[PDB]
Design an enzyme around this catalytic site. Structure first.
Site, PDB file in Angstrom:
ATOM      1  N   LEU A 183      37.081  46.078  40.661  1.00  0.00           N
ATOM      2  CA  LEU A 183      38.328  46.143  41.410  1.00  0.00           C
ATOM      3  C   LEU A 183      38.239  45.280  42.667  1.00  0.00           C
ATOM      4  CD1 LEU A 183      38.581  49.640  43.204  1.00  0.00           C
ATOM      5  CD2 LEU A 183      36.393  48.559  42.481  1.00  0.00           C
ATOM      6  N   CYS A 184      39.409  44.938  43.210  1.00  0.00           N
ATOM      7  CA  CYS A 184      39.550  44.289  44.520  1.00  0.00           C
ATOM      8  C   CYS A 184      38.924  42.883  44.616  1.00  0.00           C
ATOM      9  CB  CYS A 184      39.031  45.210  45.624  1.00  0.00           C
ATOM     10  SG  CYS A 184      39.572  44.756  47.268  1.00  0.00           S
ATOM     11  N   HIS A 185      37.888  42.707  45.440  1.00  0.00           N
ATOM     12  CA  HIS A 185      37.199  41.408  45.498  1.00  0.00           C
ATOM     13  C   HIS A 185      36.030  41.339  44.494  1.00  0.00           C
ATOM     14  CE1 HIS A 185      39.491  40.087  49.061  1.00  0.00           C
ATOM     15  NE2 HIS A 185      39.283  41.296  49.547  1.00  0.00           N
ATOM     16  N   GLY A 258      40.973  47.190  38.976  1.00  0.00           N
ATOM     17  CA  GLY A 258      41.823  47.791  39.987  1.00  0.00           C
ATOM     18  C   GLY A 258      42.156  46.745  41.044  1.00  0.00           C
TER      19      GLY A 258
END
Length: 281
Positions: A183-185, A258
């Protein structure tokens, strides 16, 4: 309190935590952990997940400052919490063998469950495995690994995205039909596959480049990123689904993603549902 000046980190020279103001907006004393309830977990004692954490805290900005970052602890522990309730173990590794570095300024100091899960796993976070050792001994065609987890936070941007080791783990996961969870970075790690058309056509969510462009304006980071993981990922065949953030997740086959520091709980739920269905069969 409303101060948007980045907060200096005393451990390192010209290195800054997020600004007080940005901290009051983007961090919270409690997480949104909920629904981690699995009336019939897996009890085989075999299948576990391999976590690839960040080993660096200091990320270099375009203006010569260091951003005091690392893995995001909510993004890291919320999905592990669900998977734990589902009956899965974790092994933790970093590229160097060095301890996993979290954004402690993001840790919810009042969340008992989150702090519970962490005291359970601190020793592994603090003395992780070395990814080369995992690759040499713990993969192959009959691994006890049911999938790999790559938490976000800007720490995921260092080392991982051009590591020949991650490349091996991703290539392994694909060929052995294994779960990849990020998820995210964190999806920046996927770029480690280089020129390999491995992920062509895959659909994911990830932190939006243009939000990275904007967050320094309130002192969240003491500078701007020197490159954009969003554009690179698209350049290797990924289709980024999300223009913004909302805690959203998505499943494309065994690839589970995510979008942001809001998506931890949902990613936990998703992965737990998917892996439970995998092993009950």
């Amino acid at each position: 309190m409303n101060d948007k000046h980045p907060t200096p980190d005393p451990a390192e020279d010209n290195a800054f935590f997020p600004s007080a103001y940005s901290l009051s907006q983007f961090t919270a004393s409690k997480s949104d952990l909920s629904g981690a309830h699995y009336p019939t977990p897996y009890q085989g004692g075999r299948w576990k997940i391999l976590v690839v954490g960040a080993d660096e805290r200091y990320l270099m900005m375009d203006n010569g400052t260091f951003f005091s970052t690392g893995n995001h602890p909510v993004e890291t522990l919320l999905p592990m919490y669900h998977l734990d309730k589902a009956g899965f173990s974790f092994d933790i590794a970093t590229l160097s063998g060095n301890p996993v570095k979290f954004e402690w300024w993001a840790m919810p100091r009042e969340d008992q469950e989150v702090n519970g899960l962490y005291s359970k796993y601190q020793s592994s976070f603090r003395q992780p495995l070395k990814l080369s050792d995992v690759i040499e001994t713990a993969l192959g065609e009959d691994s006890d690994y049911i999938g790999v987890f790559i938490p976000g936070g800007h720490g995921a941007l260092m080392g991982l995205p051009d590591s020949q080791e991650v490349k091996a783990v991703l290539q392994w996961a694909m060929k052995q039909n294994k779960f990849i969870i990020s998820l995210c970075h964190g999806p920046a790690a996927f770029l480690a596959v280089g020129d390999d058309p491995l992920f062509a056509g895959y659909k994911i969510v990830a932190f939006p480049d243009e939000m990275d462009a904007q967050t320094p304006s309130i002192g969240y980071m003491p500078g701007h990123l020197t490159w954009k993981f969003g554009e690179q990922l698209q350049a290797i065949g990924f289709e980024l689904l999300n223009t913004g953030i909302s805690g959203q997740v998505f499943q494309d086959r065994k690839m589970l993603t995510g979008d942001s520091p809001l998506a931890g709980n949902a990613l936990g739920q998703l992965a737990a549902k998917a892996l439970l269905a995998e092993v009950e069969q």
